[PDB]
Design a protein around this ligand. Sequence first.
Ligand SMILES: NC(=O)c1ccc[n+]([C@@H]2O[C@H](COP(=O)(O)O)[C@@H](O)[C@H]2O)c1
Length: 252
Amino acid sequence: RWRQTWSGPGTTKRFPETVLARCVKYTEIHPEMRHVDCQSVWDAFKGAFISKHPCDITEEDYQPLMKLGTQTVPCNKILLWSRIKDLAHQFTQVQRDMFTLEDTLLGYLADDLTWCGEFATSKINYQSCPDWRKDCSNNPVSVFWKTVSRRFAEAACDVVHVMLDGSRSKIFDKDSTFGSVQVHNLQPEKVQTLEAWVIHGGREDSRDLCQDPTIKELESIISKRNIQFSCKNIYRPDKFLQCVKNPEDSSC
Ligand SMILES: NC(=O)c1ccc[n+]([C@@H]2O[C@H](COP(=O)(O)O)[C@@H](O)[C@H]2O)c1
């Protein structure tokens, strides 16, 4: 082929082995996930998209995997993020206290991977997978992240933090998974405050990005859900991580 069926890159090479290895490694490191049989996890993950039309995936398809990956996360220590993933992960690697979705078994298994199957066969499609925009939104990858990002937001309580990319354009994007899914699934009964950390890109002396229109929009949406909103600039993310690693002393 010089064309391919779909517009998205195909399944990550060695997907089955990669996911199984990830599950082993995670369940070795994290003692609460020792009950988990990694073969059963693979089977459930496979069951969600194998032999299914990769534009006809449902949240229901992933329910066997979700059940097997059931995991308690400290509800008051949740860090969400939008667009910008690397700082969030670097932060939680020191601040081994806050947790992102990719710090959970399910997020860890799928992070940075792509997968899809075929309606007519049980073959994994290593050649192309649906693009969310060009092909269909009900594809195996997009559905998985929608389902898991939802459930992770529903687990949160107290003060929930979100890192946003202040170099973007839409610092808060209503169309992102954070904006379209997570914001609307925080539980107002349990969540007291959403606090945004607006992460600056380059910049000499920079603007208070907590005044950005899309930030005000986020404030409005959140406040109308009866959840308080707070915002902080992180003007130099590199000084920020240095202070997380070595608090006190220095220009912290
Ligand atoms: N690790 C991922 O690839 C991934 C994908 C989609 C959503 N999510 C969750 O949603 C948020 C990020 O999605 P957006 O960048 O679309 O806002 C984060 O809270 C993240 O945990 C993660």
